[PDB]
Amino acid sequence: RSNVFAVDSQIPTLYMPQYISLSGVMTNDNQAIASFEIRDQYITALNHLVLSLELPEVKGMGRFGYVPYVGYKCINHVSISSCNGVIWEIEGEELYNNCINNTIALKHSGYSSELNDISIGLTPNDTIKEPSTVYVYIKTPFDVEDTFSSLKLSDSKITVTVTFNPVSDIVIRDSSFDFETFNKEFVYVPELSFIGYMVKNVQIKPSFIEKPRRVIGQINQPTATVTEVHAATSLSVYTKPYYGNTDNKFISYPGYSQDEKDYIDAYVSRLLDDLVIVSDGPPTGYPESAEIVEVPEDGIVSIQDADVYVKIDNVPDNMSVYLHTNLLMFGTRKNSFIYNISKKFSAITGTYSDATKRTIFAHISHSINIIDTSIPVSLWTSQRNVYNGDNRSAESKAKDLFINDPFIKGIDFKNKTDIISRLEVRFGNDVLYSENGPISRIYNELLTKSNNGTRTLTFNFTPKIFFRPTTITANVSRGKDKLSVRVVYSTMDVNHPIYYVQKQLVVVCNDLYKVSYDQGVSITKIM
Amino acid sequence: RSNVFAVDSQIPTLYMPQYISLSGVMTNDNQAIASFEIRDQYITALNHLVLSLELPEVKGMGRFGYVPYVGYKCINHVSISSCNGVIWEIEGEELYNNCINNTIALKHSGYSSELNDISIGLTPNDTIKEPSTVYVYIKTPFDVEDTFSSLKLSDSKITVTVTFNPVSDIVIRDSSFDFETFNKEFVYVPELSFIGYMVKNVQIKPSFIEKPRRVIGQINQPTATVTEVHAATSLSVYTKPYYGNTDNKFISYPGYSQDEKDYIDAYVSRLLDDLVIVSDGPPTGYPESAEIVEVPEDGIVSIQDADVYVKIDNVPDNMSVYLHTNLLMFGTRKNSFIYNISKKFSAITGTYSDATKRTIFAHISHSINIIDTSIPVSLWTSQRNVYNGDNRSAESKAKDLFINDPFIKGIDFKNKTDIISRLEVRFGNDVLYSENGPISRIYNELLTKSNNGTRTLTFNFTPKIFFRPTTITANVSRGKDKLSVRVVYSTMDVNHPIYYVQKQLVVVCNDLYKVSYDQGVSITKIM
């Protein structure tokens, strides 16, 4: 029988860990780049890199906030090199995707009301945000099995290089904020930390590493190809919106609250102030194409098959209640179907306030969804729209927000709508995998215990470090040395504005490398 | 010293995984049954079964929603067989209990506002629910240790058989919905997915598997027995309500929100409309046994020792505020104790609305609990009640809901009340285990890291796949070959309606089987 009530304690290698901090050299659309040099003969190994960033004080007028997870979304590229060349590098989006299921890391990177609420400044000396510090955990393959997987610095110099996104990507602002001055005075202030191990009589062996590689397809094309694929551990596919043909303005943003319901509530709250008006006579200050009708005594207004029920309490006797019946409208033919945001409401109740002269709304019944919240403003007024799209007031138009978040997936802010209806993967000339529903995404989420998985083919099911990973292997004789992806996009109604949001296909392939430690550290691609 | 900074990477078996999808054959109270045949010489092993279901579009009038986790609660029985007979099978409740701690699987099975809100249809062409798809992860013993635990198809045919519950179990509806037509036109549309492994030169060994077995006791009896127990790894005990002697109608249901507080708020919101009435003269439309009194100037109404404080703002000068002092009442003797739902309120405030002619309530102080929310309507008006139990209005009575959820435990919707006061387990003739408090449930939750454990005796503490599980073993000579369970139910007040909810004892025993792969796959019960 095997003893399950006692073990023989082995004696491990003699070592001592230490937390080490380093300052870097900054160089410069003059993209900012920081380089850090690690050179110490007593550091035998290292892992768990953490980057810290000091965000400065922001003063002035207007509305301003940071995007959620600002620390992660400010990073464009990270590279780790030695004298033999690059050892490992990655783009910001792949790092974010790898860390998306680590709630503590996400929270450390900057996720709080103080950073992400959209604050308001009233005078040029008002303080909008106080200074603070965020930390970015740079997850690497060297962390998966603690000491067993650490990177050995075989008496070489290690350089870490961080490339930063332009500050316009991490800021959410309205048009009143003095962004040009802010961008002129903003500077990145970084510092790198890691755990070092001073080891006595270390015994080094060769090991195994996976390096991600991203390919981005052409605009609106449904194909993409990764070349020179000889030993890959997985393949992922997803889509990104392209907002380069717009002005990047949006009606609302919820800030720190990030549920779907929160998005919808922020949107509805922004529309309600212009949708129902209590006025002495016909309300003024709206464009000529607005159709504002007076609410009858029974409270029901008809908008061609759609009925809206409006009841406001405490309305002054010299005033009436009006309903904006075409607040936002879009169509491609003069007498065809119309997408009308006013028709998405069925019941509106509330009470007029004499002291503040505005309506405080209570219960709302509606059918707004995340796609409606994700339509960009410039598409409402594009050239293909045969109507005047934006019939809002000037005060409402002055509250629109610029949003340039670089890691958005799908065509909405939550990646909730699935726009891929068929996926087909070819390895060489033959079909390797095809599916209609998102069964591969379901399997990805099940196997990784994540809520935000992607369509992923996994080829490796063996334990990570103690076994060589299982791969799909090339056959250059038959020409099996490339992976081509082809999708079929879902069909949308030609009269919905979201039909004209452009998209790009993204393919991610994880290639296998061999790590050898003779003549310091070097890698060679497994073929 | 053992090296903790390097390992020797072993080379694993050469294999390649693949996602596979299959359609099935449907046959038919004409219970629906689907059978799926897996036959491919290149599939060496498989695991991670996932069932997908397409739910159709629902139109018409009335109120309609799906129960939470509809995908899991639609399954009655799953069986896996070969030519040598059944290999593994399980009932829906055991599968649900095994997956209850997997939040991602639960969410994939169908848990969202679009499915579980109680939606309303106004015209016979109104769309209540849009079509959608859910996925059910069928957790099997072959998943616990990935490739190590997978099922080997030794050149045999594998059949998966799914038996479905009648659609009445998964639907929550009011009496206005045309359920007979819906049930006539509803059809299950299933598809099975799994991960297959094509293996090169596989080396097969015998392995170990546990098969659950359920026994249900007789109505209201406090005993149950599992026979032919020779090697069991665990034993569980819990209770189920039996609603077969009622009409299955309930006053309220919270829908997507599933906290205890949410249940209570939905219940209170449904009662408040009938409990406080603003009327011109004595309110009409209530049964003759209602005792509706006018609220005095100090706002305090006395109901025999109980005092209710009622203050409503903006009451018209030609109207008064009334309180229903016996909205629901139950008692067994004419002058004994009375359970009166009106006496569970202590303070009620709000404001009358002239525009909508209804009261919008603000702060409520009450002592309603989950048992009150879980009493079925038919028990309020049973023959043993000496009063007229339901003194609500017809409009309120028309909003009651049918609920037939098949996996309810305890006597309330959350299984919060513990109705077992003593548990005694006998193996043969001698006492094997007895307890007063729920210390075995506490231990179950601690060891499995679950929030919804049950009273469980665990006999196996060894690692799952690399060791033979530890069991309690029979001794047929002394007659130790049966487990008999006896409980003592808690004592309830004879004047509480919940005292008359019937219950059944459920015992679950996990038996050990041996898996051999000679002459294909076959199992033999370990004795």
Next chain:
Amino acid sequence: RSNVFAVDSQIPTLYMPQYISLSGVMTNDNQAIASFEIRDQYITALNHLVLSLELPEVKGMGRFGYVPYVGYKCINHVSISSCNGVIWEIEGEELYNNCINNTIALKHSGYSSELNDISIGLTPNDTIKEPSTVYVYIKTPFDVEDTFSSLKLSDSKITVTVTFNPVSDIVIRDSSFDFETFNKEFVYVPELSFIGYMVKNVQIKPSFIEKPRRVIGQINQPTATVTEVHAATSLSVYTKPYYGNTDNKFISYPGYSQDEKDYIDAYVSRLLDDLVIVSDGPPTGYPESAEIVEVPEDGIVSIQDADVYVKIDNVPDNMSVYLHTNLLMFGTRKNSFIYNISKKFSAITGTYSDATKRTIFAHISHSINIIDTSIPVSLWTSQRNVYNGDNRSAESKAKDLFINDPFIKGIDFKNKTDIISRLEVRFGNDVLYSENGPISRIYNELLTKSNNGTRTLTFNFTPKIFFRPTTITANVSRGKDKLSVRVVYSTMDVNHPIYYVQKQLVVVCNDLYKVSYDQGVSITKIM
């Protein structure tokens, strides 16, 4: 190739587990102590200790609730001994810190609305709390690797000793509650449970254990030292507030809701009733130093550079709205800076209610923070304050709460403010570690997957039970045998009341011991 599709199942030691329950002997500021004796020749090993406590029914008048996690916070000290002396012991705070990341254990210890809401009693026979039972999981080193790590009772007697905190520590109450009577009649009722293993032919080996050791520095001193440190696995540093120079009264407490936002909302709700008053003529019942001004027609009141916007709806025509412009004020010089709580509000809206004669507030804009919510009442009226600090009404002053929670860290209830600006650790005479930012806390949280980490130096990265832990080792020749900690506290404004909250430095060191089982169980400190 290594087989990854099959294993050889080893046969483990023959054993059988059993749940065992024991009653104890109670002895007695007459601190209560319970001792439990475990003596049974058939119990070979044990682990997973669980303590149960019955809390009694509480009746009377006033406001009363239990602190969150009452079961954990009622324990002062736990000790495990045999005839050779103490084997393992720990203080309540170290146990709490070790279990803080186990949500299920925390919830079992007593975390619910029924226990932690601040309930109200109206008559001397009112029931404030119903009886209930909580369970405290006493995490020990013997649990980390189930059977492998269990404690072997080599035919010796084991004694478990629990020392309880005085009941004043676990109760939150107002001054109306009859605490002297409650304390006279309260008694602890404990019971110990554990999992025992009856083992056949056990094979015992020596093993390894870590024992925590706490040192508390002197009041306001920024140093502390742990002597006789020869082999430590980690070191932790944090701070505690000392409320011994106050009366322990606080303005508000949120109860069951424990987010920062919840603390702030409870505080703001308590202030609003005294901050804005609707009255017929100048409001009465406030101290003479109150400066209550009438709100002008534009609704803007100026308080020296600060502007407050006040608009209340439905104000009677014979009444006006007043604002309390110095509700709480503190300063050290007569004409210097002033900390004024009235100036932390910028906008206040609401509606007066004629039926209940009070204001129901709606939207509030403010800058209150957790430090404001954590200032004790007695510091507002200390001798160093040159103003009268508390200008509240008597009704508001009668609602203050005593809070004596013994495990508070930092200077606020959430340990959110970081008051350590520099930390320096010396081992012998040389600097072992120094940092400015909380990078060691970040690393602690990353490595332990916790949201509530502390500043911690970790010396052991090897797997726990199968390897001897790695340590920092003494060198008594050079005098490396002590760890001295020195911090630099952050600088606060001399006109903020929180500057005068006293604090203590806490250092925790984990020493290594050897466990041998010859002559029963005994330990010897590793040197």
